[PDB]
Ligand binder design. Structure first.
Ligand SMILES: [Mg+2]
Ligand SMILES: [Mg+2]
Ligand SMILES: [Mg+2]
Ligand SMILES: [Mg+2]
Ligand SMILES: [Mg+2]
Ligand SMILES: [Mg+2]
Ligand SMILES: [Mg+2]
Ligand SMILES: [Mg+2]
Ligand SMILES: [Mg+2]
Ligand SMILES: [Mg+2]
Ligand SMILES: [Mg+2]
Ligand SMILES: [Mg+2]
Ligand SMILES: [Mg+2]
Ligand SMILES: [Mg+2]
Ligand SMILES: [Mg+2]
Ligand SMILES: [Mg+2]
Ligand SMILES: [Mg+2]
Ligand SMILES: [Mg+2]
Ligand SMILES: [Mg+2]
Ligand SMILES: [Mg+2]
Ligand SMILES: [Mg+2]
Ligand SMILES: [Mg+2]
Ligand SMILES: [Mg+2]
Ligand SMILES: [Mg+2]
Ligand SMILES: [Mg+2]
Ligand SMILES: [Mg+2]
Ligand SMILES: [Mg+2]
Ligand SMILES: [Mg+2]
Ligand SMILES: [Mg+2]
Ligand SMILES: [Mg+2]
Ligand SMILES: [Mg+2]
Ligand SMILES: [Mg+2]
Ligand SMILES: [Mg+2]
Ligand SMILES: [Mg+2]
Ligand SMILES: [Mg+2]
Ligand SMILES: [Mg+2]
Ligand SMILES: [Mg+2]
Ligand SMILES: [Mg+2]
Ligand SMILES: [Mg+2]
Ligand SMILES: [Mg+2]
Ligand SMILES: [Mg+2]
Ligand SMILES: [Mg+2]
Ligand SMILES: [Mg+2]
Ligand SMILES: [Mg+2]
Ligand SMILES: [Mg+2]
Ligand SMILES: [Mg+2]
Ligand SMILES: [Mg+2]
Ligand SMILES: [Mg+2]
Ligand SMILES: [Mg+2]
Ligand SMILES: [Mg+2]
Ligand SMILES: [Mg+2]
Ligand SMILES: [Mg+2]
Ligand SMILES: [Mg+2]
Ligand SMILES: [Mg+2]
Ligand SMILES: [Mg+2]
Ligand SMILES: [Mg+2]
Ligand SMILES: [Mg+2]
Ligand SMILES: [Mg+2]
Ligand SMILES: [Mg+2]
Ligand SMILES: [Mg+2]
Ligand SMILES: [Mg+2]
Ligand SMILES: [Mg+2]
Ligand SMILES: [Mg+2]
Ligand SMILES: [Mg+2]
Ligand SMILES: [Mg+2]
Ligand SMILES: [Mg+2]
Ligand SMILES: [Mg+2]
Ligand SMILES: [Mg+2]
Ligand SMILES: [Mg+2]
Ligand SMILES: [Mg+2]
Ligand SMILES: [Mg+2]
Ligand SMILES: [Mg+2]
Ligand SMILES: [Mg+2]
Ligand SMILES: [Mg+2]
Ligand SMILES: [Mg+2]
Ligand SMILES: [Mg+2]
Ligand SMILES: [Mg+2]
Ligand SMILES: [Mg+2]
Ligand SMILES: [Mg+2]
Ligand SMILES: [Mg+2]
Ligand SMILES: [Mg+2]
Ligand SMILES: [Mg+2]
Ligand SMILES: [Mg+2]
Ligand SMILES: [Mg+2]
Ligand SMILES: [Mg+2]
Ligand SMILES: [Mg+2]
Ligand SMILES: [Mg+2]
Ligand SMILES: [Mg+2]
Ligand SMILES: [Mg+2]
Ligand SMILES: [Mg+2]
Ligand SMILES: [Mg+2]
Ligand SMILES: [Mg+2]
Ligand SMILES: [Mg+2]
Ligand SMILES: [Mg+2]
Ligand SMILES: [Mg+2]
Ligand SMILES: [Mg+2]
Ligand SMILES: [Mg+2]
Ligand SMILES: [Mg+2]
Ligand SMILES: [Mg+2]
Ligand SMILES: [Mg+2]
Ligand SMILES: [Mg+2]
Ligand SMILES: [Mg+2]
Lengths: 10, 46
RNA sequence: GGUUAAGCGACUAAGCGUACACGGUGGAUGCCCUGGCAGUCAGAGGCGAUGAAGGACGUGCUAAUCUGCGAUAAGCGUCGGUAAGGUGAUAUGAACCGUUAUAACCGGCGAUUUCCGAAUGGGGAAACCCAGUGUGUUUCGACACACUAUCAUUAACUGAAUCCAUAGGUUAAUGAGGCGAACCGGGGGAACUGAAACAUCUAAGUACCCCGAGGAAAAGAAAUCAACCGAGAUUCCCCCAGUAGCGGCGAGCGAACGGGGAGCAGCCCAGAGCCUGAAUCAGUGUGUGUGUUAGUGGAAGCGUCUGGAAAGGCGCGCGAUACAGGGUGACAGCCCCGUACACAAAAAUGCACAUGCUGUGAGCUCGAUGAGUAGGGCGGGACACGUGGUAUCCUGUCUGAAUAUGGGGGGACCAUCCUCCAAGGCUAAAUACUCCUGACUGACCGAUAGUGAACCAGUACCGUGAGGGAAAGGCGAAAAGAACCCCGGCGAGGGGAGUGAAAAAGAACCUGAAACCGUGUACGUACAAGCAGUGGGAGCACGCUUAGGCGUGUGACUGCGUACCUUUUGUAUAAUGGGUCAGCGACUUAUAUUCUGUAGCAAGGUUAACCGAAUAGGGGAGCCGAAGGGAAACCGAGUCUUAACUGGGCGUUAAGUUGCAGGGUAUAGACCCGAAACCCGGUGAUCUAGCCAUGGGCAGGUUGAAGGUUGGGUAACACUAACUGGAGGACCGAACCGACUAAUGUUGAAAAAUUAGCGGAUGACUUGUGGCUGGGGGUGAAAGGCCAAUCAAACCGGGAGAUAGCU
RNA sequence: GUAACGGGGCUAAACCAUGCACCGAAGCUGCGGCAGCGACGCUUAUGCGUUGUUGGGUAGGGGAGCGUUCUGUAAGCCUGCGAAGGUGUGCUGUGAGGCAUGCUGGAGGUAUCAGAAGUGCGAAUGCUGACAUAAGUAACGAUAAAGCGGGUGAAAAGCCCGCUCGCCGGAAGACCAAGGGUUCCUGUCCAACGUUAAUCGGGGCAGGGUGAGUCGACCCCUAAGGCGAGGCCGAAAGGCGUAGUCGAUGGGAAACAGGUUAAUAUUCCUGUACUUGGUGUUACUGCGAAGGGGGGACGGAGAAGGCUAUGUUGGCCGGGCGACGGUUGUCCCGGUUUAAGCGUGUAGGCUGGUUUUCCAGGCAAAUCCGGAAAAUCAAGGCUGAGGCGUGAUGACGAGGCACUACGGUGCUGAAGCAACAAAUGCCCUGCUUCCAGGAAAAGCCUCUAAGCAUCAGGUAACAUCAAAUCGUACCCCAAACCGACACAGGUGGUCAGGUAGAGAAUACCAAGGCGCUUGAGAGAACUCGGGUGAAGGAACUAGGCAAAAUGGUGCCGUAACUUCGGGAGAAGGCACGCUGAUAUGUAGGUGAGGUCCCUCGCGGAUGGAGCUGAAAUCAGUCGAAGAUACCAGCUGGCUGCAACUGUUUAUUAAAAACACAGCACUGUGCAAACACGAAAGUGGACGUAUACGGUGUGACGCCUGCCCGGUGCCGGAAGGUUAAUU
RNA sequence: AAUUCCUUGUCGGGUAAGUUCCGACCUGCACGAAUGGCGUAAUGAUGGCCAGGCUGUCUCCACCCGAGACUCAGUGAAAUUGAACUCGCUGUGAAGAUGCAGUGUACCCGCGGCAAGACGGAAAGACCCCGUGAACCUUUACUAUAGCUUGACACUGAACAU
RNA sequence: GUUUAGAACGUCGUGAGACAGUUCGGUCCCUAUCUGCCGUGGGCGCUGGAGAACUGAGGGGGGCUGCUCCUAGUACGAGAGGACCGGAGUGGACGCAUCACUGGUGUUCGGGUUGUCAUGCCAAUGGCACUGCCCGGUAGCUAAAUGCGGAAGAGAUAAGU
């Protein structure tokens, strides 16, 4: 599994 | 780092042993399902 | 000719490209089936305290496992069958046993049948621990059998408060316990979904849970239907009919009457006699008949050819109530096993008939005629029928009759008339299903298929657990499975030799593809820009031809030329998809309906269930069509509208119907794959959270509370001084515990750590071993935290192929 | 990057106006071929010099075919003179294709016309298997460290032996539990497994190995808790629970030392013990409970005292006279060990003791316990370390000589003492103190009921039997357990050497165990872990992040503020080595001999030998530096928030969040409210308003004002309105 | 001011220079008294600010010690990948070109390096929107319901007083 | 900083919550295949082979500037003031080279010293403790140390004469 990387913008 | 599995023969037999399973009908239904499936090892007891 | 100059100039291939040749890897294709799949016809539908199902451990000439079996341990007795061979398999070998009937094998009937498991002497973490009683043994240490669970029923004996009693208690007899596929009855009972949302409704009384029973179950002998004629228990099939109806009158749900079939069976109590053991049923013996559980016989071919081998070819025969199949060195009627037919049972057992006992009562007369019931009020449920005008059925609640001179029903209700007699019971057949047995069948599969499993598969493996769950078949006719020689490490591997038809079948073994990776040859390639090809094309190489030149490979050079799919107004697009190959992978099926095509019959067409030696025939029950109009009654080639139409609406000349194929539609998963979720039943607090019980741990070094003593002070205190004391969620700081900062690591050493520092460190501390709390629930000094690497509702299985107007 | 002719270039090769050419498309026309369609000529289901015309194409509609598997045709036909399959080649049709052949293979295949479909694959981040790419790149798992000689072997950086070096040593050593399950030992082998090689291995293979009256388990006993006759409750299932019955992590009988195996030992052997039952004998005899009582039996903290483990020194015994100056010396090295048990009952702890008497109590009884009185004794009893004696003329023991397979085996074997220091162990389940007020049961002791009191039974002494069964190897902070790994992780208990140090910190070492399963070179950038740094010193940066710095003991000294405790280790400063002296080894501690005393012993008082041993001062002395290393606070000032210790998002948030003591409101009279449960019941609580629940606030200090309209809650009930029912 | 939008309010202190900090002002956009107000010693891996010390934090890096990186031998991955004979520029173009046009440049091939681009790799986008999606949660959304409460009847009978 | 989940204030909302209002805390992965770029090689070619030294097509680097002095207190200006042009000197920044000097480093040199271990012991040494902690320091490397550089001059020009 993984943990949705939070390098996303807004 | 401590994991989810800490072996304990006394705890293992008291939780899933043949006499613990057969004490209730629901556990006895597990044995019926495993007998129907043809499991080589019915319970966890040695 | 030499020397210069200018111009041109092949030959190089580190490597690479293309073509071809030869290999490697790999296991696709084809061929094969002692495995599956779907059925047909039968049988058998249970096992178990006389200890089951399912296991554990043992048991051999046995090291393991499989298959048997249980300390009498791949078996023992007996009765049959059968027998010249035989000691199950991997799996040889060893040591043996038999050969005409005590080898072995098969069947019937017994004996033995460890331990666990309803498990039953008690306990227990299943295959273990611990007894009691009694009988009998003695070597005086013990030993061997038997009995000792619970519940229900019955009978004895005893036996409280409490005098009898009763409760209770102790024995003794019986019975029940558990397991197992589906089918059946009953007690409970969803949600997803559909309604393009969603409440009624649908899904659905489905899934699931629980109880009970049988080979079937259930139902069943009219207080039933009909309609003024009648039918005559129940169950099942085809119609009636998608009709009448039900329904946010939406989605959808959906009869009955009646008809055709399958199969038919009726009785008993609510009571006493006269008769009398009548009929009938159940037990049992006693035979017969027919099965079942081992078996017996079972016809008929030679020659030659090819070939390793003949069953094939070519000749000439023979059997057939046997040309069903299988095997045999390639395709066998006559080689083998069988098959068709004809036979067989010591013993056990089924079925049927007969018969004997043990119960069982037949017939006749006179009576009797199911009451907290019917009905009603209230609340629900079941009837297709959702309260509606709603009959009828069941009742949680509250009432409550008549009772044969009487009641029930005839879909509100009343009258009339028909029909039946509830409130007590029993009942075969036609019907449903297949864990299991036997035989047989398939326009069913052929190793990624078919059961998950053709193989020691519910195994290996994964998960705490419930549970999930694989991969993996083929040498050859016969192992003849390669003696021997050689290299090598007394290897591996290989070369010979040998076996065999073939080793181009060598156990990494039938056939052996593609991607991919190599060796060789031909050509091209080191001044040359891009979907890599195409059109043109020299040169070289090579195969034919005879010089006509064609053919093949390569290809300098040159014109043109920005992959494919999907999705889009539009993609070279820097939008999605794809590393490649091979295999697999998506518009089907059932029913109904409409249309087209086609075939048949034709104003008719055609049957369904069912019968049936049965794809025939029977069965026309029904269905469609030939007549429509109107809401309907009704009328009718007309009819409706209206008072009426000269009218107007709909009809009237026009062939349909049954198959087959196809195009649509409808219900089912409905072209395939994919949700996040909802519901149901289980598994998890060996992790973590809290709690409970019982144990353990906290080096060392400081600070010095209260209190106490002795002084000083006071009338006594207070107060004060000194000394003792050792208080604290006190201090510093290891173990221990925490995890604040930074660096590293980030396809880790590690799916959260390491290094250097950091906080707590006698406490609301920390820790070991057990225990308890379970999923809309737990637990939480509270973050939606934690509850087995998963948490704004765990995991597993089921509803389930939920749904997905989206991709 | 010229970038505004596509470029070159052009003064016409531009533009304007006339022309005549030419180039230019799959358009058009030619010359062939295919197909659709329309009306014809004859003939027409067919077809004919037909003719005219049409033929780009997604969604989609219509039409016609190919090929695959299976059924009939087909007991036919094709086929060991080579079928299918595969792999080449050639031919052929508009196409899907077809035909034939060479090679491979070695047994099937199938015309034709129909019939039926699991009937045609490139894609679905499709599924399964195989194989690429990156790529011979990253990595080969803690920077604790290796080196050499020899040996074995086909082969040695990795194995064995030897000699060095390095690492751990409160562990990286030793022993266990839990857990694993043979990994243990020996032989053999190197395919696979080991991140390399491997002769080696926790790998493969074959043998061997686990010995118990005392250790555990089992057993007796109970905790939480589980189950639970009857019972209560619940649609069914079932739930709860009494009597009971299970359930250790707790309570209960007993063994020590020495020796020995390749691998086991409190288990075997040697030596010396102990315990509980059974039986028998003998003697004396009140026994006896499903009963009573006692006992078992229990906290935290703190304070010492007495001890031992253990260590040090001396003595003794044995050995040494030193690879290089010195070393016959106050020198160097080693050894100097002995248990349980038995006897003694010590330091010390606890308690008054002994009779008689009475008594509605201890569910009945009791001789016991608990009570009441009286008498008399100045003691008695209980517990308990340790020491000593015995065990032990033994064992062990440096070493010795002989043999031998480097092992070994056999024999012999000296001293085997004292002082001092000293635990976290023992006395101690004690003592003292505190509040938060600290299991049970059985074994055990005692008491009597019923039932026996000739008996039985009890007590005592001997003899004797019996003590079963199961576990026992090995790993056990790790390569054997939990983490997919021979995984820088996790994992409970026991043991605790020397020097320095307060210490279990830390450094260096002992015993003991290891160098971490790829190496060898090179000595770039860059990255990681570190060292040092001219000058400046926060100019860096969101920010003194990080690093640097501070760091010990003694002494001096120490502010605002304060709840008077603190703040505070505030800050700040001084002294630290070595040698000598005071005092050759002091003060102190320990304490023998000796000498007195004893109702006599493990005695008391003297006595001071001998050991141990700070601290201070003075003098001297070395260095740049004496808390010299390791180890080891940066400090101060202002301010926001929270009182504080604590708790929290396991895995990006430790906070001002939560908790918190305190405060207030409110509910709750006990069959309590409330909560878990269809219910029974349970919790609340075996508590009772000085109690409990809920809510908000959040130490302490000073305080907490106004609004009852709205919304809740509480009280009232006259009137209005109003259900079932009638 | 954890509360002040305007706003870096104004004044004072601190600095050479202070949108932060500290002290006041009140103009409280939009504090306020147990959803407590104001103060408060001590405590804090608490937030902000300042000073001393201290330093490679920096001016401005230099050198050195180790472990990698590099070479050799042995063993030997991974994510990714339509196929590639995979240049620059300008322009064009599903509108930011290695692949189109034009033009320029460039012998064939490794090794050590740096990451500008390949709209690089990772993961059917979490933001936005949509679906007559899902889930939790809130409430005076709707419809119900457990529970609580009211009355009638039943269990449940007989005197008396108003 | 903004931009998740924690928490708080003000504000809005009955409330869950919300706020380009504010406050505190809060995971930044990739071993380089291709293009590109910086270096460094291999292969072949350049017409016999080979060893050297060159030509320069082409490309890159470099191109900054202050202040004093002289001209000159002159031109200009009533004065206050104060040059153009031209020539010197001395700096800043930047770049290159170098290590003589000034320094850094110099865990490979020498010494001092703490704790402990060992060499039998003493003495003298060695190991370990960050190189134990320190004091110095050769060569090399190195800057802060010291040398040098930017030009002048031509050609063709821009604006302008
Ligand atoms: Mg076949
Ligand atoms: Mg719907
Ligand atoms: Mg039966
Ligand atoms: Mg026969
Ligand atoms: Mg009746
Ligand atoms: Mg009624
Ligand atoms: Mg009703
Ligand atoms: Mg109505
Ligand atoms: Mg209606
Ligand atoms: Mg009705
Ligand atoms: Mg296979
Ligand atoms: Mg093969
Ligand atoms: Mg060329
Ligand atoms: Mg071309
Ligand atoms: Mg496609
Ligand atoms: Mg693309
Ligand atoms: Mg892709
Ligand atoms: Mg038709
Ligand atoms: Mg018919
Ligand atoms: Mg008819
Ligand atoms: Mg008309
Ligand atoms: Mg159709
Ligand atoms: Mg469909
Ligand atoms: Mg504390
Ligand atoms: Mg501390
Ligand atoms: Mg503290
Ligand atoms: Mg979790
Ligand atoms: Mg849910
Ligand atoms: Mg599930
Ligand atoms: Mg469903
Ligand atoms: Mg689906
Ligand atoms: Mg044309
Ligand atoms: Mg056209
Ligand atoms: Mg076939
Ligand atoms: Mg075939
Ligand atoms: Mg061929
Ligand atoms: Mg063959
Ligand atoms: Mg298919
Ligand atoms: Mg390599
Ligand atoms: Mg690479
Ligand atoms: Mg490397
Ligand atoms: Mg390693
Ligand atoms: Mg060696
Ligand atoms: Mg060391
Ligand atoms: Mg093994
Ligand atoms: Mg071993
Ligand atoms: Mg090898
Ligand atoms: Mg082994
Ligand atoms: Mg023994
Ligand atoms: Mg034993
Ligand atoms: Mg013991
Ligand atoms: Mg119970
Ligand atoms: Mg019971
Ligand atoms: Mg225990
Ligand atoms: Mg106490
Ligand atoms: Mg001692
Ligand atoms: Mg000498
Ligand atoms: Mg004493
Ligand atoms: Mg052992
Ligand atoms: Mg051992
Ligand atoms: Mg892991
Ligand atoms: Mg592991
Ligand atoms: Mg631990
Ligand atoms: Mg280095
Ligand atoms: Mg440093
Ligand atoms: Mg400096
Ligand atoms: Mg300095
Ligand atoms: Mg600054
Ligand atoms: Mg810091
Ligand atoms: Mg202070
Ligand atoms: Mg502030
Ligand atoms: Mg966290
Ligand atoms: Mg925590
Ligand atoms: Mg944190
Ligand atoms: Mg608060
Ligand atoms: Mg009011
Ligand atoms: Mg109010
Ligand atoms: Mg502001
Ligand atoms: Mg200011
Ligand atoms: Mg202020
Ligand atoms: Mg406020
Ligand atoms: Mg308030
Ligand atoms: Mg602060
Ligand atoms: Mg400072
Ligand atoms: Mg790969
Ligand atoms: Mg490219
Ligand atoms: Mg462009
Ligand atoms: Mg490279
Ligand atoms: Mg980079
Ligand atoms: Mg999404
Ligand atoms: Mg919408
Ligand atoms: Mg922030
Ligand atoms: Mg970080
Ligand atoms: Mg980064
Ligand atoms: Mg020099
Ligand atoms: Mg140095
Ligand atoms: Mg020595
Ligand atoms: Mg060192
Ligand atoms: Mg120097
Ligand atoms: Mg000039
Ligand atoms: Mg000039
Ligand atoms: Mg000019």
């Amino acid at each position: 599994a993984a943990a949705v990387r939070n390098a996303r913008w807004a | 780092m401590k994991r989810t599995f800490q072996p304990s023969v006394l705890k293992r037999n008291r939780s899933h042993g043949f006499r613990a399973r057969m004490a209730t009908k629901n556990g006895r239904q597990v044995l019926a399902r495993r007998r129907a499936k043809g499991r080589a090892r019915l319970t966890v007891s040695k």
